[PDB]
Design a binder for this molecule. Structure first.
Ligand SMILES: [Ca+2]
Ligand SMILES: [Ca+2]
Lengths: 209, 212, 200
């Protein structure tokens, strides 16, 4: 019928991950990538990196709308992410695979992204656990920044300096939306300042708690 | 459409995911191979990079798991449903690490219902450059690490890390660990034996069926 | 209602992906929409990326289309003609070399005639692109396959360069040639190729 999230789809027999249309709070249809395999399944994937084929060094407008390909890398769009997390309580999961096939993850108790008027402010709950480490520690309430709209608290333009949009505060390292390095490689996710971690694949996803 | 063959006849010339309806009319999105050996094949297993964990339990293999964007096991209940009626042929398409396509084709293929433990009902091997690795596997029950149904004293699924229609296992199979060996051409990816004592490594595998 | 990827883009489909559009004869066709590159709304009719698909096929194969939505494909000459038979359409060729460098070639006008006209190439001016005009001087050329030689060269161009294309008097391989230099060639070897159209 009118699935409201990937969890509803999973309950309806959809055991394989894939794209499906779900209906947002205002019933706006949105085709999203459902992770039906990982940690119970029913996760709506809003970010995916895997080979650096997609340019993520985009402006505010692009991140607002979303960009990329369903066949590969993408950013679902901030308005969409806000819409997906505005209702109820949602948990955040970050799934990563290093360049040797090791899967690692990080999970957060609650995750919400405010609307554009609030600069897509990140409302992040407690770090639940995960082999990947808590790279988003202290990021609760950080506003979103893109190369053309610096809403971070650093003297440098974080989004430019780390070539990517994120919920920056006082930036010191690149993140999952940074440049996909080739020949550190891929993208970074580290909980320890001064130490980078290279991942080939990244997926940020949400599911009602 | 009740299968990919109906879709092919319907004009769907490109391989890809489409919805079909099992006998009970319950919809199921399946990967159709419309290119290989005349097209119309319904793919129930696909491996390509070892991104998906195939060391799963009976419940997992029963329902199916993985991703439409990559590796997956369509699900034994689904596979049974797809092969329960009439006669279906089985095709296994592999690609080694040097890009060479190899295959194995069987005259008839069917997976029994869960009641009969998804027993493999395999007809005659009709040829294929990949060799007949399923030789003498007909009537074998399906075994997963948690649901042991082979005719051995050991739990084959565990020893070779992977669910399969084991009898008395000897080597790994298409559902085993996707190895990352030091050598790319051999002892890498997944195994399918061309003949007895001669194992070969494959980077990609697809198991598919088509009504005969 | 959507007649092409531009219609889909305009209706909220911002991510590239496969969607159903309706051709002039109203028959549905699932096509790959590039919603990202150069304004988006491009209908991709050819894609190469790893050499997994055999492109050395006959007239019938190229006429209907072949390949996989999950990878490499040729949408089909009848479909390409159908997609460009009305109004004016732009052609874009997006390529990626073996190091990740994206390059492109863009043409102001592009159309593939019907089968009676041997899917003749109707190509407008080269609007630009980092990849250079490799289709230079191919306007009005017929499409040729290994079993249907419609070129002007004494030899069988499609066979000689193992791939179907709008050959004149062949001299090199093209985007529909053997995927090996590695990969495919465009007047330079590339790992990924996408040919796409959008109404102008
Ligand atoms: Ca700043
Ligand atoms: Ca046993």
């Amino acid at each position: 019928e009118f699935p409201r999230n990937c969890k509803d789809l999973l309950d309806r027999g959809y055991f394989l991950s894939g794209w499906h249309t779900i209906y947002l709070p205002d019933c706006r249809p949105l085709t999203v990538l459902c992770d039906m395999d990982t940690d119970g399944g029913g996760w709506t994937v809003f970010q995916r990196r895997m080979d650096g084929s997609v340019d993520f060094y985009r402006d505010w407008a692009a991140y607002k709308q979303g960009f990329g390909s369903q066949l590969g890398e993408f950013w679902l769009g901030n308005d969409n992410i806000h819409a997906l997390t505005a209702q109820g309580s949602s948990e955040l999961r970050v799934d990563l695979v290093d360049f040797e096939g090791n899967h690692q993850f990080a999970k957060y108790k609650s995750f919400k992204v405010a609307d554009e008027a609030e600069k897509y402010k990140l409302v992040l709950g407690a770090f639940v656990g995960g082999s990947a480490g808590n790279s988003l520690t202290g990021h609760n309430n950080n506003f979103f920044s893109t190369k053309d709209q610096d809403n971070d608290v650093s003297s440098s333009n974080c989004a430019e300096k780390f070539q990517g949009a994120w919920w920056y505060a006082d930036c010191h390292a690149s993140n999952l939306n940074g440049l996909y390095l080739m020949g550190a490689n891929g993208i970074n996710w580290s909980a320890a300042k001064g130490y980078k971690y290279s991942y080939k694949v990244s997926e940020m996803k949400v599911r009602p708690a």
